[PDB]
Amino acid sequence: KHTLPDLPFDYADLEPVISHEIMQLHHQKHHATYVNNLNQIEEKLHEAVSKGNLKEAIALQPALKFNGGGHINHSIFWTNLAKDGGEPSKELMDTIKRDFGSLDNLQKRLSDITIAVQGSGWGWLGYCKKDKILKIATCANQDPLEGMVPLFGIDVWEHAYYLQYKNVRPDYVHAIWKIANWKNISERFANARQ
Amino acid sequence: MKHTLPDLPFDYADLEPVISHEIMQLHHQKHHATYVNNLNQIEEKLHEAVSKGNLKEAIALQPALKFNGGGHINHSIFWTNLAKDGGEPSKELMDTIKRDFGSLDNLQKRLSDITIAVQGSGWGWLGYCKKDKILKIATCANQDPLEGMVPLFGIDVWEHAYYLQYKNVRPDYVHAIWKIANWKNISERFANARQ
Amino acid sequence: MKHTLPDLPFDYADLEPVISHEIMQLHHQKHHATYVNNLNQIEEKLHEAVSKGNLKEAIALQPALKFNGGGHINHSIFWTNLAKDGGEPSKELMDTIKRDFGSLDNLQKRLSDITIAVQGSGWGWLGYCKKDKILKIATCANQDPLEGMVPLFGIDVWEHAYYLQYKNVRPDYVHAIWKIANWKNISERFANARQ
Amino acid sequence: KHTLPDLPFDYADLEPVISHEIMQLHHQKHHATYVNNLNQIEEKLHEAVSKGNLKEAIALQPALKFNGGGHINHSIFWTNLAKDGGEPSKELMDTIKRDFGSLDNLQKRLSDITIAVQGSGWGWLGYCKKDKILKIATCANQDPLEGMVPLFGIDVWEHAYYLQYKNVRPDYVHAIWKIANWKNISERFANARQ
Ligand SMILES: [Mn+2]
Ligand SMILES: [Mn+2]
Ligand SMILES: [Mn+2]
Ligand SMILES: [Mn+2]
């Protein structure tokens, strides 16, 4: 049932920040594999739940989280990147200033925790609806961001940057801000507020 | 269909003096019942999220399903694993115990030790690994079901399993539970696991 | 130097009827004492592994240090967080509670709810985040110390913290503990965290 | 104090299984960084333990495990690879046959669980001294193999194969057996038995 979404841009449009080969592999192989496996896992899960094998249904959870999370995360990620991303809306900039002091402080803080992820993971700018504040967080592997609405994600799995940056993850994390799609991020903010 | 609290295979006081009637009554009627009730609610929510294609919501419900589903699975096995007159391991289970642990005494020591060592709430398990065709021992956190092997005998070390009687002295409970291990059931589970 | 079990700032029966003298005596003299005794042993082993350059061994000891070290830290704070006559939040803490949670009633509800919801053994905490200069609530598993923020008030939901008195009814204990929250201490911790 | 060990071979000696660029980066950047950070963490830890900040000492644990584990794991890994690895000793082959049926079954089973690692991790062939049997296991991130003596490890962090294999982790896992250093593995087995 789930399908690989088309990117909102061509494979080379994020250069020089992220290469054509990376976009191509990342979308057509990595995200595709999460979608394919996700469809298969939902299948195994239904069989277990419909036949009453609660134990097997529990055993299938990590695979749903990993693949389901991979599909969720990458789907958001593509919308979060743009050749010409613009700037935050007035409402978002104001909120950024409120909760982080400045965009510069937010970028530094999110870059820092994202760079610090041990192993594979994601860094996120999110909106917490209960306390009505922007927050930053990281997630391991493909765990989706929970407890807050995702606004902007930074994939630090090595496949997100290795072909171009090799070991130098910090340069990729710092450079991704150049292609942050503030139009999309601001839209996600607006919707998270409503 | 809907999960139900299974009746115990004995009366609440049948395991004294190893486990008190008060413990047995709370443990079954309050703790296991709660897992069952919560499990039914969580399964309904999970079925809804799956049906609606709400992947994030389905994922968010997973800890609750594992906790309550695991609570149900674990306690259901645990009741069948206890008996005033449990008997002795079947010849084939005793022979396998000897083959894999040297003796029953060794198995009891090793499983008791790892079970006592559980940090916080959890369970100690004797299981059968079908791939390598061997008995193994393991512990699980919280209500995580034993996975990767077939459960044979479980020891609940959540403080509610023993506190009212044993207080802080978890080792006394773990050592004593062997006196009420239902070897008839454990042997049946073993025979079933080798099919 | 060697860790020691701190004396309670009150007598074992001083918190009745909210927490029984039996609970207080076991909790301090057996559970906390055990963390302290084990912590000293683990620190010695860890110091040895570090000195010898046994990296694998030092790493293997980490769960035991976190569990016992955390047990010590957590209980030490917990004793100071309880009082028969705790008083009321300082004006600055009350004002911050209002700023960050709307009211004290809201804070108590929100912290009680997440604390009640802890799966297995753990703790509920009111803390102060120094970076964002805000109060926050969180839970921790087992004896994991609250990290990333300064602990202000903790609620122990290990079953040994309440089972003898409350049995399975954890919510009654969590709601009731607010009646013995030592606001004098919590306020001092808050003032200290904003330095 | 800790230092980057020299490889027991030249950077291109594992070709065509693992490329010169991978060996170079993997050793001179990735393993080097674990060593450098490990030294720094031990420093922060000592200050915390010597000043009696138990809380800070606990906070430093993940960093010691990650960096300490990275140093342990990669140190073993280099010794586990060879252009001409030979074959298992008679004692090891016999033990492999005892606990897995055949070398083919062991390779399939270890390859399978290693391929299945979600995110970054390692696959291991180890020896359990208590039960006196070979076992296979996986570890997340840089967690060292615990509870058994390591004999042969397969690094499946994406940096271990991405430049050459890209997304195709299974081809790298299957191909690494060509360069398994059975001389070293058999020596580790012998020592684990004593
Ligand atoms: Mn990715
Ligand atoms: Mn129980
Ligand atoms: Mn306690
Ligand atoms: Mn590596």
Numbering used by the authors:
A (entry chain A), D (entry chain A): 1 to 194
B (entry chain C), C (entry chain C): 0 to 194
Article excerpt on this structure:
MnSOD-3 is associated with diapause and its expression is induced in the long-lived dauer stage. Dissection of the insulin/IGF signalling pathway has identified sod-3 as a significant target for the DAF-16/FOXO transcription factor. Inhibition of the insulin/IGF signalling pathway results in elevated expression of sod-3 and an extension in lifespan. A second MCAC purification yielded MnSOD-2 to 70% purity, while further ion exchange of MnSOD-3 using CM-52 gave a sample that was 98% pure. Specific activity was estimated for MnSOD-2 as 3622 ± 80 U mg−1 per manganese and for MnSOD-3 as 3261 ± 26 U mg−1 per manganese; the proteins were 60 and 100% metallated with mangan­ese, respectively. The C. elegans MnSODs are structurally similar to the human enzyme; superposition of all the Cα atoms of MnSOD-2 and MnSOD-3 with human SOD gives root-mean-square-deviations of 0.5 and 0.8 Å, respectively. One chain (chain C) in each SOD asymmetric unit was found to contain electron density corresponding to the N-terminal methionine residue. Two cis-prolines (Pro16) are present in each chain in common with other MnSODs.
